[PDB]
Structures are given as structure tokens and as C-alpha cells.
Amino acid sequence: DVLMTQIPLSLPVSLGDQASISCRSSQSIVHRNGNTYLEWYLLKPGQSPKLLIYKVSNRFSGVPDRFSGSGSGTDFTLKISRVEAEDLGVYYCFQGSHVPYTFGGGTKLEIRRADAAPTVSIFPPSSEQLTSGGASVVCFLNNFYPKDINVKWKIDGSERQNGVLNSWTDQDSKDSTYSMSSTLTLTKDEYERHNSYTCEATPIVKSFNRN
Amino acid sequence: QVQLQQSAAELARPGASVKMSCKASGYSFTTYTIHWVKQRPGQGLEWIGYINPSSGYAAYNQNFKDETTLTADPSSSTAYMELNSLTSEDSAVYYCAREKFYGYDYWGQGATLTVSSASTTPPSVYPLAPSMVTLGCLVKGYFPEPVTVTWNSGSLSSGVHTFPAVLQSDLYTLSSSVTVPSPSQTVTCNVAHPASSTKVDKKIVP
């Protein structure tokens, strides 16, 4: 099979700068008809893949002129000038010349921007959940930068590690921030026996008292 | 307008078969091929095969040929992919896309296939009630993926974060948060669970 290898794996870019992604085929991808069926796709968060470039260098209708494709032989390049926040996502090259058709492994473009502190919110278990016998304590850390953030739980002042699951969004294409949920799931039995619940973002702190 | 509309997410048992559909509208169906692409976390995108409705010919990736049959019904402008001998390796999002010499210009919306012996379980939706106010939406205990969350039937789109689900004890859970400015201007999360054909609305009260 034709192996399609992309460089780099991760492409952080500051807004307004240029960027390029390389795609190298393991053999020539010229069809016997003389065409080179090399395409570039962008997979944006929550969307189906979008065509950018076909036949090496032909922009698809609606794609801005900031995107351009070039190459021959076995090395193909996608260039983006004046990167915008809407350009984040996973870029794939693809060859449609020789069956089986093959995709590159993907390059994740991310926006590098200034640091931003999270907006932190905490929520006790709802009455509806508690009636059924479960107790989810939920904490949102919204619109922060960079992606790496530590969340810490305290239950009446003592650190709490069991029953915490964390989940991050993809990068926001409006403000280039990230958000995360942290969820402490207890039994109602366990929830009922403690008063103070804290989530700390690192230190931005939000807590409540009930049980 | 050109559109590729896939069948809904679905659950299949190990060892069974499943038939996934792609209804093409907005063009002369026989004049474009339909290709199928598999998306599985950590595995990028894989090409499965294509069918050319004009000729009837389907091409298959050798890695998929023993588990895959592609068909197309010109009369209904629908392409199908049947997967046999299912295993958990087949759990993925599957797309269809059309192609005739200018790349995959239009794609279906994708369909999540889960291969499991587990039953379908609809979500329980709980309120997360409190210049700017953050409200939310805990969507607990559903199977299989996905759920979709909107706010105010999609009329409220700005300031939303719907987090990826986490799997625990064979069930999924996720939360959605919304932020609005502090009259009769209410806030309702709308949760759809296509694999169980269930929709729930939860109006957030203080």
C-alpha cells in the first residue's frame, strides 16, 4: 500500500503567522492517466472532514486563498498563510491514485495564544439525582489557556482522588481557549456524611456546603 | 442542494451484521462514486472502499474485504455498507462521501457504530442550577454513544461547552455548560440519544 506520512504531528501556530504541513508518499502517486490525486482535508471539532485541496494544488470552491498546495514526486506541502482561529483541527493528506486509497496520519493544528485563567463553577448533586441514590459533584473550568490544568478536590478540607473523572473540550475556534469538566461521583451514602466540597483550579477555588 | 444523509448511530451484537446507509440527494446519483471511511480514536481515517453506481463496481480495501459488502440502489439514490462478523474492532464512526475526480467534496454526517452485547440505555438528564451566569446539563448513564445536546432548540448556540463523554461501569456520562447575561427568557437543554430514539428537555430552574 502507499504509506502517507505527515510532518509535524502537532502544529501550534500564533494567529497571523504562516504554517506548513508536509506529506510524503512511500511511492509515486501518479495515476496512469497522468493525474496526481493528492487531496488535503480538515477535520474541525464536531464536523465531518472538509475538502481543502484536490489534485495537489487546486483549491476547492469556498476555501480561502490563504490555503495552498504544492508538490510532486513523493513530497507534498499544504501552506496556510495568516493563520486564523477557525483553521484549527486535524489536517489529513490523502492519495486517490492507487487502490487502496490511503490517508496520512493527521497533523493537529492548534492556536498558540496568551495565557488565560479559567472561569470556575461548582454544582452539588441535583435533587432529582439524589432521589435515585446517586451523587455527582460537577465542576466546570471554562475558557482557559493553555490546555494543561490541574484540578483538585477537597471534602471537608481533605484531598480527594477516588471517583474523579476529568474531560477536556477541543480548542475553541472563536477565542482559542480550552474548557474542562471535573466530576466527583459518590454514593449518596458517602455524599450525605460530608459537608464541604471544594474544587480548586491551578489557585481559583469554588466550594459549597450541603450533604 | 447536495446532501449525503446517513442512517442513525446504532448498536450491533458481536458476530452479527449491520447495514449502514447513505442517501444522496441534490444531484444525479449515478454520476458520482460513494466512498466509505472509518474513523476510530488513535487510528486516524481509513478508506474502506467505494461503489460506482453507474457501473455497479465496488472496490474494497483488502483489509476490509472479508467483512464488507458495498451496494447501491439507483432508484432510491442510496448507497449501503454491510459489515459482517462484527467485533469490537468495528466500533467507530463511519462516513460516506461522494467523489468524481475533484475529491470528497460532500460528506455524510457520520454514523457511530458500537459493537457490544450491552442493552441500549437512554440518558438521565439532571439540571446543574446555580454579570454572566453559568448553567448546565448532566447527561448520565446512557449507552451507546452519542448524545447530542442543544440549548433552546438550537436558538442558543453562543457560550456553550459540551464535554466529551467518559465510560464508567459500561455507561457513558457527559455534561454541557451554557453562559448567558443575567424577562421571560428561559433556558432549556435538549438532549437527543439517537441509538434509543429518545429526546429529553430539561428547563433549568434556580
Partner: peptide
């Protein structure tokens, strides 16, 4: 293949 007609 179908691309021969391109």
C-alpha cells in the same frame, strides 16, 4: 478504473 475517464 473509473478514474481512467478523467
Amino acid at each position: 478504473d473509473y478514474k481512467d475517464d478523467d
